[PDB]
Amino acid sequence: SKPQPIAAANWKCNGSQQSLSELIDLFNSTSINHDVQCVVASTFVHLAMTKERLSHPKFVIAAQNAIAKSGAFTGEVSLPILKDFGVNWIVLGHSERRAYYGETNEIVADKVAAAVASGFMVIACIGETLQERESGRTAVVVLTQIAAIAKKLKKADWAKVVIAYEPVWAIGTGKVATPQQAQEAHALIRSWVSSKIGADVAGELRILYGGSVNGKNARTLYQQRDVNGFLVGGASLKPEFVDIIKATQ
Amino acid sequence: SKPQPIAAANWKCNGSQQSLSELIDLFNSTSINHDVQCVVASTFVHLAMTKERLSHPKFVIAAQNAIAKSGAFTGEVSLPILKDFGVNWIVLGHSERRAYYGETNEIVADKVAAAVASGFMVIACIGETLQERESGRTAVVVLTQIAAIAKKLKKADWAKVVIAYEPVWAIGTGKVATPQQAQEAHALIRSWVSSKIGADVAGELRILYGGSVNGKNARTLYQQRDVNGFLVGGASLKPEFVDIIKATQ
Secondary structure, eight states, X not given: OOOOOEEEEEOOBOOOHHHHHHHHHHHHTOOOOSOOEEEEEOOSTTHHHHHHHOOOTTEEEEESOOBSSOBSXXXXXXHHHHHHTTOOEEEESOHHHHHHSOOOHHHHHHHHHHHHHTTOEEEEEEOOOHHHHHTTOHHHHHHHHHHHHHTTOOGGGGGGEEEEEOOGGGSSSSOOOOHHHHHHHHXXXXXXXXXXXXXXXXXXXXXXXXXXXXXXXXXXXXXSTXXXXXXXXXXXXXXHHHHHHHTTO | OOOOOEEEEEOOBOOOHHHHHHHHHHHHHOOOOSOOXXXXXXXXXXXXXXXXXXXXXXXXXXXXXXXXXXXXXXXXXXXXXXXHTTOOEEEESOHHHHHHSOOOHHHHHHHHHHHHHTTOEEEEEEOOOHHHHHTTOHHHHHHHHHHHHHTTOOGGGGGGEEEEEOOGGGSSSSOOOOXXXXXXXXXXXXXXXXXXXOHHHHHHOEEEEOSOOOHHHHHHHHTSTTOXXXXXXXXXXSTTHHHHXXXXX
């Protein structure tokens, strides 16, 4: 049987007070007649309002990044500061951070072990670029990514971890993977996990698909055996996100 | 004569709601009789609290970094997002961003130019490292850093810019910076402005000292001709900051 899904909204670097408040109203309004954990990842600035206005029993708030410790890191936000703030969910190793903000496999691994140590629920992002995929190198990349993370966690840690599989080619291009491409990537991951960590662990593990998920394609995606939920980008700024969540029935 | 001074508190990646609440109150009780602009640069996460609680007519809020546009930039915070939330001050190009976060002269320059466009008041940070000083490249480095910024701006835009000189060569290195040395870097920056941009602008320009400042040497540092105030690190988290503000009289 499938583990408890997740429907995660990554708002990225977007929104205004008014637009967001609107959205939040809508979600609080929604009747979620199934066991699904919904996560709202707002900008750092929006965390207070979000934490103030979000009322739904099925939603939690999350941060989009963090550094490990407090210190002489102008412009950054640490885990201790998020936690004193009452945030306990975090998104780490997003492909945008990887692509743009110099985050290496090692760096993501360090961030994830840290977060796990401070007691946060982590959504850890992994995935291959157009390039890699075209080169028939998807398995090596994905595996190398998860392996790096795994290297620093304790079997026990696994309970706090959520995997997000986000095909770099699939971001902001309209190009969603097929349910067969997603299922195969997802089964590859879980197989590493069962063999490497334990079936037990493999079995409780949430693997979220990311990359052009929309109102339309999510039901079919969800149907795949190794798909446990979604990390949504642009459609999370829309009423459609409601449609996405429902698809997790 | 000197233009209006600025006393900027750079909290970096520090703070708990309690500890900051406690510091904000002290600030609030502070008696400041002269014409000084005080700036409080919190983490993005503390902006809301800060904004609500800080009531002193002489204090404004600032951000510690931003990206130019809203978009698919997970974990980052943009100018429009900050504008909407009512922050109109920002610190850009901090030594730490330059060192660990890949901010080149060109990136910093882009950030400044966009912030300016958006009507923000900008504290733009420049400074040479131990090796550049030692290698005799102080002038070259410094002047390249300001020029990079100047090229994207119009003369009228200057009204919105504050320069922060950080003697990076003296931070964490074991070296000691003297008022005289501080003055020499400030004189160099002003001269370039005076010359390239104009004397009028140069005369109005605020140049802040971004080195190590405590209650103890602030007065001395302020004694210097071309020192217009401070961008404060560690001491800004302390009651001692009130002594630094006083030092600008």
